[PDB]
Design goal:
The structure is cut from a larger assembly and holds 8 protein chains of 8 kinds. Chain A has about 230 residues and is of the alpha+beta class. Chain A is built from 6 helices and 9 strands; from the N terminus they run H-E-E-E-H-H-E-E-E-E-H-H-E-E-H. In chain A, helix 2 crosses helix 3. In chain G, about 35% of the residues lie in helices and about 20% in strands. Classes of the chains: A alpha+beta (about 230), B alpha+beta (about 210), C alpha+beta (about 230), D alpha+beta (about 230), E alpha+beta (about 250), F alpha+beta (about 240), G alpha+beta (about 240), H alpha+beta (about 230). Chain A: Keywords: Cytoplasm, Nucleus, Proteasome.
Chain lengths: ~230, ~210, ~230, ~230, ~250, ~240, ~240, ~230
């Protein structure tokens, strides 16, 4: 009926708004940024028991010092992640230093609007919660199909993102310790699941300030965090 | 460059009979051979034959290009192809790489059909490495051993001739020519096409 | 932006090609006869006002020394098809050094018409060529359509009232017909088709007399034939 | 048209061409895959006209590489095209890395290609669901699945095509770890015949090992269909 | 649906865009007549603006208006239709004539130029993203045999020869006028027949249009063997010819 | 955009709507027959009658040869057929150029179905409204016969019939065909199923056309039956 | 009935509505007048619609441009489409001088510009230009040569033309007398009076911060020159004094 | 009604609806305001903050020494335009070793607006830029989705711009010939009028550029001092 790049009477692009509709469904994920580092997590929406659950992974690494958490159309998300890590390694080749997270999300947003001729064919329909550490300090960032990127102390994406933002607003406080951040993330995540929290039912990653290195928590660390989790 | 894989071809005409012949050598580094079966004659149609002399890879590549074009022509037209059409198309192909050419000096030997019954007119012609066609109407020779063959044919050609005498004539001309060239020889084959039949024979040459 | 304006409808039928045949059926008729020792292409031109000269407009053309052509439809389509057919005959003669076969030319022009039916951003050609010629394999007569399909005929008619002209030509035709009798049957067929009165400058004829060049008859020769 | 977007987001936020490709998949014939220990079993159905059709010309189940194998459900022409693409990419990887292509790379590449045709103008989505079987670089058997949307995941067992939900429900309550070859073939033949008419001629089952893919003979299949027919009755 | 918006065949076999462009040419209500005799060929048109929103204002140099252009020294033309389309058509004609001289080394023939412009018009008809050029016209010249020539083309791409023709409204009614005057002529010096042809053209335009034809409001040009070049005649000489007709 | 035809675009049910209309165009066309025999492979067909003044001599409009060892029968639009015939001949001679051996028929039909699938998927061009019965011989697999369609699908067939009244023809083939059979028996069965499909008791010699391909004397060759040979075959059919 | 949706479609009456809509847009846009005189030509532009914008600087918005410093070019319509056409005129002049080492004749330049504008009214994908352009020059021998190209692609020579809003009353005042014999310097009085009369949006205060001017006459040695305020403000004061009386 | 399907179709009134919708997207954007005196152009804007956990978005951007912009509309389009202007100024200073002429840059970006409005299968940018610079004179320019640009003494973009414009034309005469401090104060009054719900150090942006004053955002302490002066 209309083209991809047709403005609405209200000045909004139809395809961009429909892409915003697509990210409203998906796996819930939560991010927290504190002085000692950054934390990301996902509800790990497991399919039937015949799936391995190792291949189905929601927390990938753009680089050694950057994590991510996806939402929406996932194949489009892997395409964006692949382009992001390629450009970050291009920075690492052209410049010795590690790329800042702001530049990475700016490049990701630049690719996301490539369908508007100003090649791709439509918006990507992906929301990312990128997190990392650099010389400026630890931070996390939000991305959406409209190209605007906003920088957060704590956020969430996916299906139950509204309640996750409400609980993060109620509970998050500045000058927080990293252990406080981990238990806060698991409390919010547990409150917004459908199924009971467990070890295989959740995945976590973090990038410490000292290490400046991506590190996905294994089953032992997750169980240790769950055992000291209030209820 | 033609000393590398030296070769020779020959073709005569007669009374309702035509002959084509070649040497079976394949050279390498001029003065050492590697095979005694490399036929320069290639059948292409029921009454058209072509003799390619020069570099072996160019001989083979030109054979597949012409076979592609020929079999396309019989399949589309659904009828047998003429010698003149093949000669003109060969001249166009050799000219199409006027710069960086195929290092091959081919010939064409066959029969010309004049329908009305039908009469088989002999046809012979020769080419440079670009397609410098020249109708000859008698003996046609091409290769490194061309001069010796030109010397032999005028002494030995007897105008129109029987197919047996044509075979003796072309065989003696080729054998006397190849004996006087060091980089050309190692056996021979003589194809004598007629409308009724074709006789293919190999000669007890100085292959050593 | 390039997309096929021509497309399959339910039950197919290629509606644009059907409209092209409707254009051909309304256009001024043409016909051709294959004889024992010759082939004819003939067509009537509309009864002209005195300002037109027939020495400028020509529905009869020659592609080569031995090959003629006549059409029924849009003139510009016929002009571009004729020019490209001349180029095809020329490139074949450049390659193989001979006058082009009728079958190869018919196949190439049929493929071009199909390409214009299939290609996006275009419409089919609104005419129906009628190629005649002589070569080694006897005489031929062919008929191109907007669909890009060719049919081998021995005698055929195109245009308005083509079914009735086909029936009349079937009534008066023999395989061993002489060339003069074929010309007379062409004149009688177009006379029955026109529903009027004919003369020189109202009809045009082309013919190939044996293994000789394709010839277009002047008005004097046609006036001799009409008597 | 040439170079324009034909798949687009609906008002509800769905790419309707991708769901239409999913219905095209769902109309296509069924296929099953199982793995255990160091081998895998691949099963696909079959449909032929008796006395006229040649069963040899069917290529529902194939081999891509020395070790990788593939099964599909949907439009067969698109499957053949993507199969040739993946074989080309297999030999391209083997010329630029000098190691045979692992199954994970090929599954990722198939998903990438299907997302590419889903996210470019002038091309509609590949109307096929594939599931690839092969050995990982560490000599570990893993079978991958792939949807037209570009989604892929690793499964211990899964099915596609007509009535895939029912077969997948059956496999959830019968799959075991580290089963014998006869046990895997038995389980696959039971699973495919839950939603397929019972006859030896309606399946083409094979077993993949590090040596090569070996298709099961007709006699063993006839014994197996007779045995499960006895078991049901 | 959309059978006639583009250059497409309608259910009856009629590309309706052709007649729409032709009637658009007619709506400009500029008449242009051509005629040939022996060793001469005269072309005439009106010195007015076409019919559209802009009207002829007082501060408009009426001399600059002209429907007769030229392609080459030996070849002239009179395009009638939309102004931009006519200007584009003469530029394309100039291009084909000049590349013909470059490639073939001798000046083009008007028949060949008419066929070439008809082929470009065919290219416009065949494709959809090409709008039709609403610009019909005449071309005149003298060929290698030293005889005159006059050709016409439409937006249909139908090039055909003539010895007398008219572009614009009332063409069917105007064919009788040209036939009548040509029959009158059929019932001569190299210069006297030029005069006869010129009075025939002006009388034909007078009879077709039916008003006085002020010489400032028209424009006349000729090629002959005396000159062989396309030279457009001055206003006073046309006034003398009109007074002779009166 | 507004004038787009929606060619390469899925249905709600996943059919594309264009190959379907192409197949209805196929089903209205003249019938073609296919048979594999121990001595050869046969592609008999039925001429559509345009006029009696059509040249009976030659003018084989349904069966065409792609090479000395490959030949096919058309069951749809003739122009879309002939362009694909030219592409097929090009692919055959290209393979012979590349590899210096004859192309197997399976490779060739894969190439035609691939190029037909391309216009079904890429671009916005209509598909080719033609379905072939490609047959031939190779040393790898011997006599084969296939059935191509506008979707780019192909499948092997020992014997099949396509076009109008293909159900009745396929029923006759299922009833009468045998695994091992002679060339004459196959030709007679081809006349029988053509007569059954055409709703005629006795087939007309002018209304049909036959061809066969045999690997006789270690050199494969095609034969195209003339009017007198078809008259003799119909005489044998009436006798039998 | 769908024939006015694309420029490439002729109406059943044989008429391109899509160009008429462009004409209607041009007629409603800010007006421009350009006429000739003895000493030279003066050409003006009346930016009436920007009376609401009070924060714009004094006389910054100038729609009058030039090529080669001897040819005025201006417009009445879309600013961007106009500026693209100006840049194309500069490009054609550049190509002419690189080829020939001579300034381009104006009568050729208008023809090339008309073909460039006409070249965009025969594609569905290209948008036709929404701008009516006036080109003019002056030299002592051949006198002024004012042309006007339109969206249709028609170039006609004028001795004076107005386009845009209020154009009928402006021309109704321009044919009030013959300006071929009136000097360039004292015609500013007439133009100021006419813009006060015809336009129903400008007053005494708007007259020195919205309206543009330039001339190419003997006083500037027949080259382009935006007019200095010491010449404008005497005639502006006398014109408003006359209108007040 | 039906003449808003594409950007290449004039309505019967003769209007491009798509370009007007892009201008509507600009008008719904966040606020901004710029002021100049005799030797200083001050720029300010309200940085969007969607949540208390969200931090303020970047509103003001820097393009080159002595040149800067402010934003209102689609942010990705602003990213593209910023990269283009930065590349243009840096390329000019590369090949010529001098600062670029500001109005030539404005014409360049307006040409980029034009070529995307004109051809089909492309969209106009949903953003307008508030360009401020000192090219031997303070200057304030404007861009619109149609190819067009105007020069201002003062300007505002989107949100409750009516209150700001009313304050600016109420006090336009005093902007010329006043010091920089009162200039910053007046800009803050205009932004506070656009608030209508309080101005803080976090949620506002401020930049200054002038003679012997390259483009530099105001620090937190100075901005807090000016905000306290506005409150008093």
């Amino acid at each position: 009926d209309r083209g991809v790049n047709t403005f609405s009477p209200e000045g909004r692009l139809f395809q961009v708004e429909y892409a915003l509709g697509a990210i409203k469904l998906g796996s819930t994920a939560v991010g927290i940024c504190v002085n000692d580092g950054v934390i990301l997590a996902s509800e790990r929406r497991i399919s039937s028991t015949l799936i391995e659950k190792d291949s189905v992974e929601k927390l990938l690494s753009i680089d050694d010092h950057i994590g991510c958490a996806m939402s929406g159309l996932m194949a489009d998300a892997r395409t964006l992640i692949d382009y992001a890590r390629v450009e970050c390694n291009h920075y690492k080749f052209i410049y010795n230093e590690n790329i800042n997270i702001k530049s990475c999300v700016e490049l990701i947003s630049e690719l996301a609007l490539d369908f508007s001729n100003l090649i791709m064919s439509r918006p990507f329909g992906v929301a990312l919660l990128i997190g990392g550490v650099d010389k400026n300090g630890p931070c996390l960032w939000y991305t959406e199909p409209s190209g605007t990127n906003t920088r957060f102390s704590a956020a969430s994406i996916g299906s139950a993102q509204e309640g996750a933002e409400l609980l993060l607003q109620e509970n998050y406080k500045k000058d927080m310790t990293f252990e406080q951040a981990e238990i806060l993330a698991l409390t919010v995540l547990r409150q917004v699941m459908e199924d009971k929290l467990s070890t295989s039912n959740v995945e976590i990653c973090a990038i410490k300030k000292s290490d400046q290195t991506f590190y996905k928590y294994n089953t032992d660390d997750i169980s240790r965090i769950i055992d000291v989790l209030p209820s | 460059i033609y000393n590398y894989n030296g070769g020779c071809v020959l073709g005569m005409s007669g009374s309702n009979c035509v002959a084509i012949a070649c040497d079976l050598r394949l050279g390498a580094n001029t003065f050492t051979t590697v095979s005694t079966k490399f036929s320069k004659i290639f059948k292409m149609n029921n009454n058209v034959y072509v003799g390619l002399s020069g570099l072996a890879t160019d001989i083979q590549t030109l054979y597949e290009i012409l076979r592609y074009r020929v079999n396309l022509y019989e399949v589309r037209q659904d009828a047998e192809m003429d010698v003149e059409c093949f000669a003109n198309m060969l001249s166009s192909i050799l000219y199409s790489n006027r710069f960086s050419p195929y290092f091959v000096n081919p010939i064409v030997v066959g029969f010309k059909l004049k329908h009305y019954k039908v009469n088989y007119e002999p046809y012979l012609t020769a080419y440079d490495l670009i397609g410098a066609k020249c109708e000859t109407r008698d003996f046609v020779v091409n290769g490194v051993t061309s001069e010796q063959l030109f010397g032999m044919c005028e002494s030995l050609y007897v105008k129109d001739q029987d197919e047996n005498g044509l075979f003796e004539t072309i065989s003696q001309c080729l054998l006397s020519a190849l004996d006087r060239d060091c980089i050309s020889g190692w056996g021979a084959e003589v194809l004598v096409l007629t409308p009724e039949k074709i006789i293919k024979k190999k000669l007890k040459a100085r292959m050593d | 932006y390039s997309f096929s304006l021509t497309t399959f409808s339910p039950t197919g039928k290629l509606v644009q090609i059907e409209y092209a045949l409707n254009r051909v059926s309304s256009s001024s008729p043409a016909l051709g006869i294959r004889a024992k020792n010759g082939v004819i292409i003939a067509t009537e031109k509309k009864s002209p006002n005195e300002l037109i000269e027939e020495n400028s407009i020509f529905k009869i053309q020659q592609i080569s020394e031995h090959i003629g052509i006549v059409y029924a439809g849009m003139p510009g389509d016929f002009r571009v098809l004729l020019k490209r057919a001349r180029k095809e005959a020329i490139r074949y003669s450049l390659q193989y050094g001979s006058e082009i076969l009728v079958k190869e030319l018919v196949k190439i022009i049929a493929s071009i018409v199909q390409e214009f039916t299939q290609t996006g951003g275009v419409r089919p050609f609104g005419l129906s060529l009628l190629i005649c010629g002589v070569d080694v394999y006897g005489y031929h007569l062919y008929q191109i359509d907007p669909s890009g399909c060719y049919f081998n005929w021995m005698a055929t008619c195109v245009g308005k009232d083509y079914q009735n002209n086909m029936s009349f030509l079937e009534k008066r035709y023999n395989k061993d017909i002489e060339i003069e009798d074929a010309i007379h049957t062409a004149i009688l067929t177009l006379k029955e088709s026109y529903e009027g009165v004919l003369n020189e400058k109202n009809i045009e004829i082309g013919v190939a007399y044996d293994n000789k060049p394709f010839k277009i008859l002047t008005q004097n020769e046609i006036k001799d034939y009409l008597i | 048209s040439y170079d324009r977007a034909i798949t687009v987001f609906s008002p509800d936020g769905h790419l309707l061409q991708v769901e239409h490709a999913l219905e095209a998949v769902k109309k296509g014939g069924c296929a099953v895959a199982i793995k255990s220990s160091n081998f895998a079993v691949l099963a696909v159905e079959k449909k032929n006209i008796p006395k006229l059709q040649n069963p040899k010309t069917t290529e529902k189940l194939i081999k891509l590489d020395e070790h990788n194998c593939l099964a599909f459900a949907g439009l067969n022409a698109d499957a053949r095209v993507l199969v040739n693409k993946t074989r080309l990419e297999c030999q391209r990887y083997y010329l630029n890395m000098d190691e045979p292509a692992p199954v994970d790379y090929i599954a990722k590449y198939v998903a990438k290609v299907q997302q590419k045709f889903t996210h470019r103008g002038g091309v509609r989505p590949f109307g096929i669901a594939t599931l690839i079987a092969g050995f990982k670089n560490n000599k570990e058997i893993c079978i991958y699945q792939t949807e037209p949307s570009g989604i892929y995941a690793a499964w211990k067992a899964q099915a596609i095509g007509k009535n895939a939900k029912i077969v997948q429900e059956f496999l959830e309550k019968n799959y075991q770890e580290n089963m014998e070859q006869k046990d895997c073939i038995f389980l696959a033949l039971k699973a495919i015949f839950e939603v397929v008419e019972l006859s030896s001629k309606n399946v083409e089952v094979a077993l993949l090992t590090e040596k090569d893919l070996t298709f099961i003979e007709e006699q063993e299949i006839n014994s197996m269909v007779e045995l499960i027919d006895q078991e049901r009755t | 649906m959309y059978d006639r918006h583009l250059t497409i065949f309608s259910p009856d076999g009629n590309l309706y865009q052709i007649e729409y462009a032709i009637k658009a040419v007619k709506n400009t209500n500029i008449t242009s007549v051509g005629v040939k005799g022996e060793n001469c060929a005269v072309i005439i048109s009106q010195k007015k603006m076409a019919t559209q929103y802009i009207s002829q204002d007082k501060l408009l140099d009426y001399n600059n208006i002209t429907n007769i252009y030229n392609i080459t020294d030996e070849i002239g033309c009179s395009m009638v239709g939309m102004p931009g389309d006519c200007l584009s058509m003469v530029y394309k004609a100039r291009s084909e004539a000049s590349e013909f001289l470059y490639s073939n080394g001798y000046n083009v023939n008007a028949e060949t130029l008419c066929r070439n412009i008809c082929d470009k018009i065919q290219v416009y008809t065949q494709h959809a993203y090409m709008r039709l050029h609403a610009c019909s016209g005449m071309i005149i010249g003298i060929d290698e045999n030293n005889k005159p020539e006059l050709f016409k083309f439409d937006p249909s791409g139908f090039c055909a020869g003539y010895r007398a023709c008219v572009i614009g409204n009332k063409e069917q009614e105007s064919i009788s006028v040209l036939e009548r005057l040509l029959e009158k002529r059929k019932k001569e010096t190299i210069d006297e027949d030029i005069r006869n042809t010129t009075i025939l053209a002006i009388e034909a335009l007078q009879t077709i249009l039916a008003f006085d034809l002020k010489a400032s409001e028209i424009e006349v040009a000729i090629v002959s063997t005396k000159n062989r070049n396309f030279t457009q005649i001055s206003e006073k000489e046309i006034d003398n010819y009109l007074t002779y007709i009166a | 955009r507004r004038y787009d035809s929606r060619t390469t675009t899925f249905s709600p049910e996943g059919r594309l709507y264009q190959v379907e209309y192409a197949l209805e165009a196929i089903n209205n066309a003249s019938i073609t027959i296919g048979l594999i025999t121990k001595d050869g492979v046969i592609l008999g067909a039925d001429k559509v009658f345009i006029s009696k003044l059509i040249d009976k001599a030659n003018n084989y409009e349904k069966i065409y040869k792609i090479d000395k060892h490959i030949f096919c029968g058309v069951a749809g639009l003739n122009a879309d057929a002939n362009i694909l015939i030219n592409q097929s001949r090009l692919y055959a001679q290209r393979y012979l150029y590349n590899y210096n051996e004859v192309q197997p028929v399976s490779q060739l039909v894969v190439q035609i179905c691939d190029i037909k699938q391309s216009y079904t998927q890429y671009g916005g061009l209509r598909p080719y409204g033609v379905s072939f019965l490609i047959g031939g011989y190779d040393t790898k697999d011997g006599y084969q016969l296939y059935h191509t369609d506008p979707s780019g699908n192909y499948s092997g067939w020992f014997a099949t019939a396509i076009g109008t009244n293909n159900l009745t023809a396929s029923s006759v083939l299922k009833q009468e065909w045998k695994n091992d059979m002679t060339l004459e028996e196959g030709l007679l069965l081809a006349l029988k199923t053509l007569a059954k499909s055409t709703d005629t008791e006795i087939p007309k010699s002018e209304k049909i056309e036959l061809a066969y391909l045999t690997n006789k004397d270690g050199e494969v060759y095609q034969k195209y039956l003339t009017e007198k040979e078809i008259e003799e075959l119909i005489k044998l059919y009436t006798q039998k | 009935a769908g024939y006015d949706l694309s420029v490439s479609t002729f109406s059943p009456d044989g008429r391109l509505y899509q160009v008429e809509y462009i004409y209607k847009s041009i007629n409603n846009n800010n007006t421009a007048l350009c006429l000739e005189c003895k000493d030279g030509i003066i050409c003006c532009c009346i930016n009436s619609n920007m009376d609401k914008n009070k924060m714009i600087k004094k006389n910054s918005y100038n729609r009058i441009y030039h090529v080669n410093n001897n040819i005025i070019i201006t417009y009445s319509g879309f600013d961007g489409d106009a500026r693209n056409i100006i840049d194309r005129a500069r490009s054609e002049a550049n190509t002419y001088y690189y080829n020939f080492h001579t300034n381009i004749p104006l009568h050729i330049l208008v023809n090339r510009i008309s073909l460039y504008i006409h070249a965009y009214t025969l594609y569905w994908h290209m948008r036709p230009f929404a701008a009516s352009i006036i080109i003019s020059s002056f030299n002592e021998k051949d006198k002024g040569d004012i042309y006007c190209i339109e969206p249709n692609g028609a170039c006609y020579k004028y001795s004076g033309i107005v386009i845009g809003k209020n154009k009928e009353m402006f021309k109704t005042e321009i044919e009030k007398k013959d300006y071929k014999d009136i000097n360039v310097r004292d015609a500013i009085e007439d133009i100021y009076k006419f813009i006060l009369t015809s336009d129903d949006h400008m007053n005494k205060n708007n007259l020195q911060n919205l309206v543009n001017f330039s001339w190419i006459c003997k006083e500037s040695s027949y080259e382009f020159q935006n007019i200095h305020e010491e010449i404008l403000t005497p005639a502006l004061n006398k014109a408003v004094e006359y209108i007040e009386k | 009604n039906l003449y808003d399907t594409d950007n290449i179709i004039y309505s019967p009134e003769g209007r491009l609806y798509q370009v007007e919708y892009a201008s509507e997207a600009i008008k719904q954007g966040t606020c901004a305001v710029a002021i100049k005196s005799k030797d200083y152009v001050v720029v300010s804007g309200l940085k969007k903050c969607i949540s208390k956990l969200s931090f303020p978005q970047e509103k003001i951007f820097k393009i080159d020494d002595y040149i800067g912009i402010s934003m209102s509309g689609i942010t990705s389009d602003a990213k593209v335009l910023t990269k283009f202007m930065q590349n243009e100024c840096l390329s000019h200073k590369f090949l010529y070793n001098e600062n670029i002429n500001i109005e030539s840059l404005v014409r360049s970006v307006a040409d980029k607006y034009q070529k995307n409005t004109q051809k089909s299968s492309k969209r106009a940018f949903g953003v307008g830029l508030m360009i401020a610079a000192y090219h031997n004179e303070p200057c304030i320019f404007e861009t619109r989705p149609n190819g067009s640009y105007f020069e201002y003494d003062a300007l505002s973009f989107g949100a409750r711009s009516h209150a700001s414009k009313t304050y600016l034309e109420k006090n336009l005469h005093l902007f010329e010939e006043c010091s920089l401090e009162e200039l910053i104060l007046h800009c803050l009054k205009a932004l506070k009028c656009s608030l209508s719900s309080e101005l803080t150090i976090s949620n506002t942006a401020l930049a200054v550029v002038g003679k012997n004053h390259p483009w530099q955002e105001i620090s937190s302490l100075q901005l807090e001092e000016y905000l306290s002066k506005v409150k008093m």
